[PDB]
Design an enzyme around this catalytic site. Structure first.
Site, short mmCIF file in Angstrom:
data_model
loop_
_atom_site.label_atom_id
_atom_site.label_comp_id
_atom_site.label_asym_id
_atom_site.label_seq_id
_atom_site.Cartn_x
_atom_site.Cartn_y
_atom_site.Cartn_z
N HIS A 21 34.45 32.62 38.57
CA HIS A 21 34.82 34.01 38.88
C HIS A 21 34.65 35.00 37.73
CE1 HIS A 21 37.17 36.86 41.58
NE2 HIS A 21 36.90 37.55 40.48
N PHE B 235 36.33 36.73 56.90
CA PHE B 235 36.42 38.08 56.35
C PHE B 235 35.44 38.27 55.20
CE2 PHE B 235 39.74 41.63 55.50
CZ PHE B 235 38.96 42.50 56.24
CU LIG Z 1 42.35 39.80 53.29
CU LIG Z 2 37.18 34.07 42.68
CU LIG Z 3 33.59 35.59 42.21
#
Ligand SMILES: [Cu+2]
Ligand SMILES: [Cu+2]
Ligand SMILES: [Cu+2]
Ligand SMILES: CC(=O)N[C@@H]1[C@@H](O)[C@H](O)[C@@H](CO)O[C@@H]1O
Ligand SMILES: CC(=O)N[C@@H]1[C@@H](O)[C@H](O)[C@@H](CO)O[C@@H]1O
Ligand SMILES: CC(=O)N[C@@H]1[C@@H](O)[C@H](O)[C@@H](CO)O[C@H]1O
Ligand SMILES: CC(=O)N[C@@H]1[C@@H](O)[C@H](O)[C@@H](CO)O[C@H]1O
Ligand SMILES: *[C@H]1O[C@H](CO)[C@@H](O)[C@H](O)[C@@H]1O
Ligand SMILES: [Cu+2]
Length: 499
Positions: free
Chosen positions: A66, A463
């Site tokens: 991330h 989503f």
């Molecule tokens: Cu959400």
């Molecule tokens: Cu993430």
């Molecule tokens: Cu990411």
């Protein structure tokens, strides 16, 4: 501390995170996983070894890094069936990528289904040997990283589809109650007079936290890996996957202070030291704080964050002033989330492989109605108008492969095309405030890239969209190692109960 090159062995084990025992997915024996470190410029070679045995939390895995751009290494991005097929149990897979141009606080987590909730998650920090803010603190190391975790007594694939609260908040892997208010709390040590770069990461699957430390101010210097103008706050509301570096000056009396991290839902408050940890000055007693909470007079407001060095907003200072503007219309039908009338269903062939095998537009790409093609070297404007049609606000949306300018924050009606913060996870606010969170980025990074709510339970319920950025140059810009090419045949061969 586990250097640029390391093995990440992923196994099942019992864990007593909050004094309650349950089986889970762990990295090198523990959850949250070990902290990964390195310096700006390093090559990261992370050998993920899949030794899972338990189908109920999934035997297969895929790890996402991330905050990292993965430019030229889209294959290593992580998201299952977008960038790779999952690693199969018994096999191992090397994630190999450089970080020439990024430094800050990051994390890593499974990007297969809701697996990371079952505890495939940990922090990841890349230090800057020439950090512009280095003169603002004395201490920055393993012990200055603070993780937040929403911990569940029932496994991800076993409990309710939308849990709406965890049993215990964990701060640095430890937390309490409310059926175990005598479990160990995390202790963070400070020496009176020293300044600390505390790196706060939400490893959260769902809730956001109002984070604070009794008797102390906090100076924000980093937001989602982006260097930031010093901003003095006394309360940080941090949404899933977000990061902040703040500097704490240890300038108060030698004592114990409550570290607080209050979830928006679940078990709220601080009765019996739930949602709590300890700031302990060297010399003070190994006991719990007796400090009391004061009103947050200077809460973090996102519109007060500005990048440390001036950074131009893509496009031009007018609504729609970009090459391509896209609105994301949210929806929910009881069990599934929809963006622009489409609910994300992962395809059998990873989107990446589809492009390399020579898809030309969105119409050639499966998960139809969910892939958007983007032109190269263009300015893009995304807006996420908040609506009661999608339950579970505020939704934190995350873009893979890019940092973006937040030209319009939640809880604000103003548009900043001058100097808004750049980040990679943004709260899309509430329908009640009439929010229309609007972001901008530059298409400088060819590949398929996920855009989704970083509430993992919502991502699982579809989503999500995929940005197929600069399709023409995807295959050539992202050469893939045979180990990656082997991933799908091996995974597809697997019986259903071995997945
Ligand atoms: Cu959400
Ligand atoms: Cu993430
Ligand atoms: Cu990411
Ligand atoms: C005694 C009992 O009800 N067992 C289940 C166990 O099988 C399961 O793993 C867990 C969910 O994580 O919940 C319960 O403890
Ligand atoms: C993949 C699939 O067929 N799912 C659909 C889903 O889109 C829809 O939300 C639901 C009705 O609520 O019916 C079906 O299950
Ligand atoms: C906590 C959890 O994830 N649930 C199950 C657990 O009931 C089971 O015992 C285990 C296999 O040993 O697999 C997992
Ligand atoms: C990207 C996008 O959907 N922009 C829309 C624009 O098309 C429309 O004219 C207007 C409707 O009021 O709102 C804005
Ligand atoms: C705000 O976001 C966009 C602006 O581009 C609008 O089209 C939408 O109607 C929402 O209210
Ligand atoms: Cu993601």
């Amino acid at each position: 501390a586990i250097g640029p090159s390391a093995n990440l062995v992923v196994t099942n084990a019992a864990v007593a995170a909050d004094g309650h025992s349950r089986d889970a997915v762990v990295v090198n024996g523990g959850t949250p996983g070990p902290l990964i470190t390195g310096n700006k410029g390093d090559q990261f070679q992370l050998n993920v070894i899949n030794n899972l045995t338990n189908f109920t939390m999934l035997k297969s895995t895929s790890v996402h890094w991330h905050g990292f751009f993965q430019k030229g290494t889209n294959w290593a991005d992580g998201p299952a069936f977008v960038n790779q097929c999952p690693i199969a149990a018994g096999s191992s897979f090397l994630y190999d990528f450089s970080t020439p141009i990024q430094a800050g606080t990051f994390w890593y987590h499974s990007h297969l289904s809701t697996q990371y909730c079952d505890g495939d998650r940990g922090p990841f920090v890349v230090y800057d040997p020439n950090d512009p803010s280095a003169n603002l603190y004395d201490v920055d190391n393993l012990n200055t990283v603070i993780t937040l975790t929403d911990w569940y007594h029932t496994a991800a694939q076993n409990g309710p589809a939308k849990p709406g609260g965890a049993d215990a908040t964990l701060i640095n892997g430890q937390g309490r109650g409310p059926s175990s208010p005598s479990a160990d709390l995390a202790v963070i040590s400070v020496t009176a007079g020293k300044r600390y770069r505390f790196r706060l990461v939400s490893n959260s699957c769902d809730p956001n936290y109002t984070f604070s430390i009794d008797g102390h101010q906090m100076t924000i210097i980093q937001v989602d890996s982006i260097n930031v103008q010093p901003l003095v706050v006394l309360k940080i509301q941090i949404y899933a996957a977000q990061r902040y570096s703040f500097i704490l000056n240890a300038n108060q009396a030698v004592n114990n202070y409550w570290i607080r991290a209050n979830p928006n839902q679940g078990n709220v408050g601080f009765t019996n030291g739930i949602n709590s940890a300890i700031l302990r000055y060297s010399g003070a007693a190994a006991t719990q704080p007796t400090t009391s909470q004061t009103s947050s007079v200077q809460p973090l407001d996102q519109t007060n964050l500005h990048p440390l060095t001036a950074t131009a907003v893509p496009g031009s200072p007018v609504a729609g002033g970009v090459n391509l503007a896209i609105n994301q219309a949210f929806n929910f039908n009881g069990t599934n989330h929809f963006v622009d009338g489409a609910s994300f269903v992962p395809p059998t062939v990873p989107v990446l492989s589809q492009i390399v095998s020579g898809a030309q537009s969105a119409a050639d790409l499966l998960a139809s109605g969910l892939v958007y093609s983007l032109p190269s070297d263009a300015n893009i404007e995304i807006s996420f108008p908040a609506t009661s049609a999608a339950a579970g606000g505020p939704h934190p949306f995350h873009l893979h492969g890019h940092a973006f300018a937040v030209v319009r924050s939640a809880g604000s009606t103003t548009y900043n095309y001058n100097d808004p913060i750049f980040r990679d996870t943004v709260s899309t606010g509430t329908p009640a405030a009439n929010d229309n969170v609007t972001i901008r980025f530059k298409t400088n990074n060819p590949g398929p890239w996920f855009l989704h709510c970083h509430i993992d339970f919502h991502l699982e319920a579809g989503f999500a969209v995929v940005f197929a950025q600069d399709i023409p140059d995807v295959a050539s810009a992202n050469p893939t190692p045979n180990a990656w090419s082997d991933l799908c045949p091996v995974y597809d061969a697997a019986s259903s109960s071995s997945q």
